[PDB]
Design a protein around this ligand. Structure first.
Ligand SMILES: Cc1ncc(COP(=O)(O)O)c(C=O)c1O
Ligand SMILES: Cc1ncc(COP(=O)(O)O)c(C=O)c1O
Lengths: 380, 380
């Protein structure tokens, strides 16, 4: 992380657009009011290996919603995990229990850096499908669909549910309907990384469209669910893993196998996050409060994207920045070149990674004008 | 399993001696006052991959002593882990990656069951050395020494620092001096599981003799350190891994390799327990209180062992129970036979595992007389 150089930078006017976590308009970490009001347990005894049971139940219901048949019929195997990262790893380690010939996983051509190592450790080579279009800083749907169609039948296909990291480029629900048809027809196994449900657009149901739509279409769906961003619980390491199966008996056999993976890795998961999420989701008042706060976070991110674009136009930039508003979530592929990123750092002390990814959570009312002028100056 | 059957058991007068965690004399979970008085962080941001730096620093000093030469020279590589379990796993994964033909590890013939699966996941087969003497319910030192001397040069040797789980049988410091001489002479790699420092005898320096004694004797010492029992932080999953090396340069490179193992496992470790331990160990008031609370927990366990033996004699048992007082910690190998354990359950509703292990943390002033009479009855 570029944090060290930013911190060491003596310049009076500097901006860190490399951060990985939410910040409010005052550039402060943001502890949710619903999290402050959550009730903790009183016992520090170990949780069960598969997690606090009420937490896992609420995580399932939040992921799949109130009218999910799979959930009703008990055919989903689930557990608490060490954030979304733990779910990706434990899920990856579980895949050979139900996927034949399981040595490859397909992910978007521009994707989340840690995915490669996670799945390598689990015995699978991450291989790309067409996804990001650098000319438009947007989606290459035709390319995605063709790659999925040509992949061997029974391939594992990694997809981001929403707020694609690092580009911010998300397919529409129309686009996802086409994607899921290919996944079903080719008998592929979807592995959904859902790290930003509710955080992405402020709408929990909309943001969970991809796992909810797939769970009825395929024999097995995997979902890695993170509570880091949407509850602001990052460092407490709170997530869940879900695998759908044909029957409650199949799900039970997979939960036993989950336990055999968890116990010799970390024995059992940390209490704090699970207490907080379970407390909030079982309380109507706290749940309502949480939903209001989700919208506050998602609206601020959306509005600062919109403000960046409008300020760029006000500065006199003649280039097109509409991708910044089309993209969703904290991470934006700006389209700035390596040279331009290097100039923003040297000349303006604005820090972002060399791929032109900007963490827009670092943008706010007090610096968006400065950053816009800088981006105009290095691109004009 | 047993715990479920216990909880399901209708019997009004029943005792669970199969638990894994400390209980006070009222049979309640026990949160330490020093933990209640600790100051938590305010920011829920992710910790560094290797953990909260102040916690890791305090963990090192607590393990090796503040004046440790290895520590002053910076030649110990350390990181925060998910309890002692995570330190065992990461340590094993590191050994198997970097030590040639490291596909085996030697552990005590009666040992902690999860050790076998932890090291199996790391690609290392756990194989026994003579340790427990069933005739005496005590130590077989000559057998241990002979086994360690015969193991191939450069073997990984797993040892419990104190409060051996599940037997309670510990070598004395005199004995450990003999063990460590063999380990040095044979160029073995010691892997110390220190799950109970201070919790074991109430004396933090005494309980850390094994790693402190070894760290100046061998080129590489590995220590898995748990804060679950000695801070009562079980479910918050707080531990540390330490690996000594020839130099600070080697240590720094090793820490880099730990990060490569951690990141695709769970990205970074949970804040809460690290906050608590760092807070306590940096505050003189909290540290002094913690030491007294540890002495009180350790003394309660020692005193109820003593009381079981004295009540067994009062009941009229003519058998020898001195092993119960010689053993150290929460776990006692009682020497009850399988049939005797089964009758304890069926006639007296006292629950132990069939190997005759009793968790004496489940014994207290309100049930020790009952349990003594029951144990007398089934062995007379
Ligand atoms: C796409 C994606 N997957 C997984 C993760 C890891 O999330 P967690 O902190 O819950 O492990 C992140 C968060 O940075 C992410 O952006
Ligand atoms: C000997 C031993 N090693 C390791 C562990 C695992 O401890 P932790 O909860 O810190 O992962 C235990 C605790 O039960 C243990 O008894």
């Amino acid at each position: 992380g570029l944090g060290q150089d930013f911190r060491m930078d003596p310049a009076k006017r500097k901006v860190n657009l490399s951060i990985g976590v939410y910040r409010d308009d005052a550039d402060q970490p943001f502890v949710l009011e619903c999290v402050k009001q959550a009730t903790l347990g009183t016992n520090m005894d170990y949780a069960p290996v598969t997690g606090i049971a009420s937490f896992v139940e609420e995580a399932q219901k939040l992921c799949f919603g109130p009218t999910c048949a799979a959930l009703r019929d008990g055919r989903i195997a689930s557990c608490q995990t060490l954030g979304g990262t733990g779910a990706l790893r434990i899920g990856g380690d579980l895949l050979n229990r139900f996927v034949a010939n399981c040595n490859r996983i397909y992910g978007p051509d521009v994707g989340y850096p840690n995915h490669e190592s996670i799945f390598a450790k689990a015995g699978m080579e991450l291989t790309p499908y067409s996804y990001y279009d650098p000319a438009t800083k947007g989606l290459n749907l035709a390319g995605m669909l063709e790659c999925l169609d040509k992949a061997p039948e029974g391939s594992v296909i990694l997809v981001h549910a929403c707020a694609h990291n690092p580009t911010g480029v998300d397919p529409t629900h129309d686009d996802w309907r086409q994607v899921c048809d290919v996944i079903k027809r080719r008998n592929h196994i979807p592995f959904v990384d859902m790290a930003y449900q509710g955080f992405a657009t402020g709408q929990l149901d909309y943001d969970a469209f991809v796992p909810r739509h797939l769970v009825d279409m395929v024999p097995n769906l995997i979902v890695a669910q993170s509570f880091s961003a949407n509850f602001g619980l990052y460092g407490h390491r709170c997530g869940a893993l879900h695998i759908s199966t044909a029957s409650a008996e199949e799900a039970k056999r997979l939960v036993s196998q989950l336990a055999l993976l968890i116990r010799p890795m970390y024995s059992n998961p940390p209490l704090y996050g699970a207490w907080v999420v379970s407390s909030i989701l079982k309380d109507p008042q706290l749940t309502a409060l949480w939903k209001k706060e989700l919208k506050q976070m998602s609206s601020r991110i959306a509005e600062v994207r919109k403000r960046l674009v409008s300020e760029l136009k006000a500065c006199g930039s003649v280039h097109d920045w509409s991708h910044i508003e089309r993209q969703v979530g904290m991470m934006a592929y700006t389209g700035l070149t390596r040279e331009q990123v290097e100039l923003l750092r040297s000349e303006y002390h604005i820090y972002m990674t060399l791929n032109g990814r900007a963490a827009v959570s670092g943008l706010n009312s007090t610096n968006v004008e400065y950053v816009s002028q800088a981006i105009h100056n290095v691109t004009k």
